[PDB]
Write an enzyme that holds these catalytic residues in place. Structure first.
Site, mmCIF file in Angstrom:
data_model
loop_
_atom_site.group_PDB
_atom_site.id
_atom_site.type_symbol
_atom_site.label_atom_id
_atom_site.label_comp_id
_atom_site.label_asym_id
_atom_site.label_seq_id
_atom_site.Cartn_x
_atom_site.Cartn_y
_atom_site.Cartn_z
ATOM 1 N N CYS A 120 -1.254 8.492 4.383
ATOM 2 C CA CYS A 120 -1.461 8.114 2.992
ATOM 3 C C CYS A 120 -2.791 8.640 2.480
ATOM 4 C CB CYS A 120 -1.447 6.594 2.850
ATOM 5 S SG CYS A 120 -2.768 5.787 3.760
ATOM 6 N N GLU B 33 0.870 -1.153 0.000
ATOM 7 C CA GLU B 33 0.000 0.000 0.000
ATOM 8 C C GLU B 33 0.918 1.216 0.000
ATOM 9 O OE1 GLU B 33 -2.740 -1.112 -1.047
ATOM 10 O OE2 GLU B 33 -3.394 -2.859 0.103
HETATM 11 N N1 LIG Z 1 -1.538 2.993 1.317
HETATM 12 C C1 LIG Z 1 -1.359 2.851 2.733
HETATM 13 O O1 LIG Z 1 -2.132 2.153 3.374
HETATM 14 C C2 LIG Z 1 -0.219 3.559 3.441
HETATM 15 C C3 LIG Z 1 -0.170 3.605 4.852
HETATM 16 C C4 LIG Z 1 0.898 4.266 5.504
HETATM 17 C C5 LIG Z 1 1.909 4.881 4.753
HETATM 18 N N2 LIG Z 1 1.865 4.837 3.341
HETATM 19 C C6 LIG Z 1 2.912 5.480 2.549
HETATM 20 O O2 LIG Z 1 4.212 5.363 3.086
HETATM 21 C C7 LIG Z 1 4.954 6.435 2.537
HETATM 22 C C8 LIG Z 1 5.840 7.094 3.576
HETATM 23 O O3 LIG Z 1 6.389 6.137 4.454
HETATM 24 P P1 LIG Z 1 7.955 5.812 4.416
HETATM 25 O O4 LIG Z 1 8.755 6.977 4.894
HETATM 26 O O5 LIG Z 1 8.298 4.794 5.451
HETATM 27 O O6 LIG Z 1 8.384 5.382 2.938
HETATM 28 P P2 LIG Z 1 9.597 4.407 2.572
HETATM 29 O O7 LIG Z 1 9.164 3.609 1.301
HETATM 30 O O8 LIG Z 1 10.899 5.190 2.245
HETATM 31 O O9 LIG Z 1 9.899 3.402 3.755
HETATM 32 C C9 LIG Z 1 8.951 2.453 4.163
HETATM 33 C C10 LIG Z 1 9.720 1.280 4.720
HETATM 34 O O10 LIG Z 1 10.463 0.691 3.669
HETATM 35 C C11 LIG Z 1 11.775 0.535 4.176
HETATM 36 N N3 LIG Z 1 12.663 0.458 3.027
HETATM 37 C C12 LIG Z 1 13.216 1.464 2.257
HETATM 38 N N4 LIG Z 1 13.945 0.921 1.265
HETATM 39 C C13 LIG Z 1 13.864 -0.473 1.342
HETATM 40 C C14 LIG Z 1 14.366 -1.541 0.626
HETATM 41 N N5 LIG Z 1 15.196 -1.361 -0.525
HETATM 42 N N6 LIG Z 1 14.065 -2.792 1.013
HETATM 43 C C15 LIG Z 1 13.289 -3.055 2.084
HETATM 44 N N7 LIG Z 1 12.774 -2.041 2.818
HETATM 45 C C16 LIG Z 1 13.041 -0.772 2.461
HETATM 46 C C17 LIG Z 1 11.975 1.668 5.113
HETATM 47 O O11 LIG Z 1 13.075 1.464 5.931
HETATM 48 C C18 LIG Z 1 10.674 1.633 5.818
HETATM 49 O O12 LIG Z 1 10.629 0.651 6.782
HETATM 50 C C19 LIG Z 1 3.999 7.402 1.920
HETATM 51 O O13 LIG Z 1 4.023 7.366 0.543
HETATM 52 C C20 LIG Z 1 2.698 6.948 2.442
HETATM 53 O O14 LIG Z 1 1.663 7.284 1.605
HETATM 54 C C21 LIG Z 1 0.793 4.173 2.688
#
Ligand SMILES: NC(=O)c1ccc[n+]([C@@H]2O[C@H](COP(=O)([O-])OP(=O)(O)OC[C@H]3O[C@@H](n4cnc5c(N)ncnc54)[C@H](O)[C@@H]3O)[C@@H](O)[C@H]2O)c1
Ligand SMILES: NC(=O)c1ccc[n+]([C@@H]2O[C@H](COP(=O)([O-])OP(=O)(O)OC[C@H]3O[C@@H](n4cnc5c(N)ncnc54)[C@H](O)[C@@H]3O)[C@@H](O)[C@H]2O)c1
Lengths: 546, 534
Positions: free
Chosen positions: B319, B285
């Protein structure tokens, strides 16, 4: 506080499995089938691509041959070019919103009407086209092009209509409702030669759920596939909902995976082809408007495991059917038989005796035929290579059969091979031919051998255990939990029936979305939840903040 | 299994929950927890030490933790795989019991703890922590347990002489759960839902939500989760993704976060397809650029309060947060005046010390920098005007004031790109161009997550609902675009917003089971020949 969105009550549907007919002498269905077979003898149907309601011909002419009489071209068809495929996409997309907005019950009606046509007036036609075009015998055509296809259409209609009744909780001051939207974009349906019903399901289930589809049927099942398509259109499927687009495989895959509007691929066939498509989608991920959904059911290297307590006659008949029906050309066919030493003399004797009684021949002309020719020249060549391997491999011995002859049809006799090596390549690789390999294990090593059943191959599709000892059945069931997505106790590893044995498996055998069960349709809807609030909102502050 | 939603508490003065929360907050002031990786029952430290800072007081290290290296992650995979079969063989109800017990703990004795850790560690206010770490997480656990136990009752038709039964197997292999900073509950669900269904999980929590994430983990273990079912493995993101996508035993990734990260993982899995024992299942998501669309018949006060909440609660770090508001010219003087007046009263500050705080600092320095870039863009662009706010200060916390911007360009980059900050952009449309503008709501962005229409005209609502069918997977009529409740608004959307598996609804758990159907035949099979052949 009047509700501006009003939701209508959802209906229910009563369906049951389509009865299998007996085709006894003098019966109407036997007479009708014989007439339909007569109607196809010496005939070639020119089958166009269909985009909307337009019959389109390209210059890339192709032929479908009768497997048991390959001099007989049963169909002349053509491959859609990239231009036509892209035109088909555009037209399907332009039709999608209206179709998606149609009530689920109205879309279901098309499939229910088609099911009734297949059951009655068109049964002989689809059976005969499956027999002549794909080489099926009467009963194999009956369980497939009639019963299974009819059941997919009726049961999926039931599941889809009832799915709308799955609704969330509402609490004042709001009303919540789930809209089961089709996927936004188009779905590519890519079907295999070996079941007429699978093509209908692969294109039909997504269409039922409000999707639009480009259906590329299998070249070697073209005749029956088109028959199914025409029935759907006659049953009321609107234009541009399913585009009938035979095409070169790679050309088709390249085209659909290059479209920004691809939202799904519904595939059944080999592992490498599915993997290729999966990689193409990943390569092009940035162009897609949404993340495409890939569904793929692929091959198996399926087992019958015999315990010393087994009913010998059941092992023999069940194994002969599973290994050799439709020439072993089923994802679910038994190709490895594990037998305890204590039962091997009895089972070997019975297998060889019954083997000598199996008739291979023309399924249209001789209803005594147990199974007929394999599908095409490529299949014949692959199987021949395996037969030659059996003759050359020191660990392999041919016990029965081994002959083949492609002078008139792609005929391969049923073949039973014994392997002294439980890891021989023939124990691991899917042949898709009437080739059964037997491994004889010492009774005292049954537990270790169960581990071999589980670990030897890359597949996880079907498997059977033959045993009358309850403890053993429980133990084997536990040990083989992930060796088979369709697991059988004292029955053969083939012949899943819609609504009774939802079909599919994991490991290398695919995504296991269980077509035939109530959850399959969920892959083809992307739900939206609507919340309507019936009272003004209050302040942005909360009371605790005071 | 019968289940209802957890009550949202009011936290009135003198209430048991307010007293308990204040005590828990006091307990955490000045504290740093050293949080190890947990593999099985082993608490493991690596030399790769990391810190979680309090967003509104970044001098306060709320946790010291460490990144698991490739070797530790691989050992965690091995240990999890060896535990999986026994866990998968456990009755669904027995697995569900762990989550039901955990839910009861969160509801009662641990409520104040998880709320306080979410406030101090992620910068949430009381109510945002309450709806997240308590209510949403509790609801995920109770509702998913109900859905799972009831799923076992979905069985096929049996016809004599055979009996058919479906076994809802867990996926074979391990699932990688990768959770975001912004909801404590999402981490619990991402790791917990697959575990419930008989999977084993490597859970990499968000660095910036470590404190509350570990609290949830410990609660699950105390509630009876056996060792090696969920491994608690903070790690560098790319290192984690590389490692899990390199394992032949990967069978799922349960992700919530940014689009680019999810696409990267999807591509890594595709590159390595030939190595995997089965096809891994990816659930993701991702972000949204969510709308509030106003028709001239709207209730203005509802538009104003709903939009202020949607755009600015938790600093817009949802989000689902409204970041584009479409207003008809006839209502703009009202809505503009009210937004700007109410804006002046929004308190941004320390949520632990001042319960009057509407929202607090954004999560970290990186987020602060990204949001500042957007504010600087708003000051630069000829089509953008900052109407209110625009201030930011990272000296003590990562503080960004709520900002309201008007765009004269409905297609400006700020109308399209997810900022994840308290930055609301307004486009004013001529009343007579309402249908054209509805089309723009649908066509402008790449996203399809949430959106709301405010209108008190039935025909308009019906038209807007039809037109925006694919613009929002969670669509709202006369309510704000945030605040989905488990079991009431299953959450998710398509277009670029993810795979839309609808966590919070009854079907989500199906992504984490691979069914097996067993047919047992109770009579001998007879001849291989058929009657019609004779
Ligand atoms: N659609 C939904 O239900 C929902 C809910 C909450 C947040 N979000 C989204 O999350 C985003 C912001 O959150 P964010 O700062 O954590 O984004 P992010 O993608 O940078 O990080 C999310 C997670 O992924 C990890 N990560 C980053 N690179 C990775 C890799 N190569 N391999 C494995 N893990 C990796 C991070 O450490 C973190 O735990 C926004 O776009 C928001 O909309 C969506
Ligand atoms: N698990 C199941 O339910 C199930 C059912 C039937 C068949 N199968 C499997 O299918 C296999 C045999 O069928 P097959 O001969 O048709 O396999 P196949 O992969 O050679 O062809 C399947 C289909 O894919 C098409 N195709 C090939 N390359 C393509 C490409 N690059 N892009 C798009 N389409 C492409 C073919 O034209 C055909 O329509 C066996 O492995 C069998 O086990 C599985």
């Amino acid at each position: 506080g009047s509700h501006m969105l009003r939701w209508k009550h959802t209906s229910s549907l009563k369906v049951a499995n389509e009865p299998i007919l007996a085709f006894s002498q003098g019966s109407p269905e036997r007479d009708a089938l014989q007439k339909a077979l007569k109607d196809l003898k010496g005939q070639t149907e020119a089958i166009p691509c269909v985009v909307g309601d337009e019959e389109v011909w390209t210059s890339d002419i192709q032929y479908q041959l009768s497997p048991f009489n390959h001099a007989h071209k049963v169909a002349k068809f053509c491959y859609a070019d990239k231009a036509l495929l892209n035109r088909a996409i555009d037209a399907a997309l332009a039709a999608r919103k209206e179709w998606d907005l149609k009530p689920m019950a109205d879309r279901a009606q098309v499939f229910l009407k088609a099911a009734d046509m297949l059951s009655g007036p068109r049964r002989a036609e689809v059976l005969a086209k499956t027999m002549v075009g794909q080489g099926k015998t009467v009963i194999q055509a009956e369980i497939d092009a009639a019963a299974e296809l009819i059941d997919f259409f009726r049961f999926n209609a039931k599941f889809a209509v009832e799915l709308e009744g799955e609704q969330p909780i509402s609490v004042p001051p709001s009303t919540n409702h789930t809209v089961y939207r089709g996927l936004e974009g188009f779905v590519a349906a890519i079907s295999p030669f070996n079941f007429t019903a699978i093509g209908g399901n692969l294109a039909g289930a997504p269409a039922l759920m409000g999707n639009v589809v480009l259906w590329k049927p299998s070249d070697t099942a073209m005749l029956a596939s088109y028959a199914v398509y025409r029935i759907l259109r006659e049953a009321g499927l609107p234009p541009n909902i399913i585009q009938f687009v035979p095409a070169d495989g790679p050309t088709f895959g390249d085209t659909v995976t290059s479209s920004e509007h691809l939202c799904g691929i519904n595939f059944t066939g080999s592992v490498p082809t599915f993997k290729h498509l999966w990689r193409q989608v990943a390569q092009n991920l940035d162009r897609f408007r949404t993340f495409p959904r890939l569904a793929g059911e692929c091959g198996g290297k399926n087992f019958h495991f015999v315990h010393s307590s087994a009913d010998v006659d059941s092992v023999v008949s069940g194994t002969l059917r599973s290994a050799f029906e439709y020439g072993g050309q089923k994802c679910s066919a038994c190709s490895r038989l594990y037998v305890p030493k204590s039962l091997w003399p009895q089972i070997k004797g019975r297998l060889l005796e019954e083997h000598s009684r199996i008739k291979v021949g023309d399924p249209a002309e001789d209803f005594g035929t147990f199974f007929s020719a394999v599908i095409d020249a490529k299949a014949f060549a692959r199987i021949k290579k395996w037969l030659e391997h059996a003759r050359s491999s020191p660990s392999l011995s041919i016990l029965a059969g081994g002959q083949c002859n492609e002078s008139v049809g792609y005929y391969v006799e049923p073949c039973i091979i014994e392997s002294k090596d439980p890891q021989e390549p023939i124990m691991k690789e899917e042949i898709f031919g009437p080739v059964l390999t037997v491994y004889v294990y010492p009774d005292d090593k049954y537990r270790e051998t169960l581990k071999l059943v589980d670990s030897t191959t890359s597949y996880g599709l079907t498997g059977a255990v033959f045993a009358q000892d309850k403890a053993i059945v429980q133990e084997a069931t536990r040990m083989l939990r992930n060796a088979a997505g369709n697991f059988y106790i004292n029955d053969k590893s083939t012949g899943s029936v819609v609504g009774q044995q939802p079909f599919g498996g994991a490991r290398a055998s695919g995504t296991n979305d269980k077509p035939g069960g109530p959850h399959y349709i969920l892959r083809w809807t992307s739900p939206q939840v609507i919340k309507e609030t019936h009272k003004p909102l209050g302040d942005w502050r909360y009371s605790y903040m005071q």
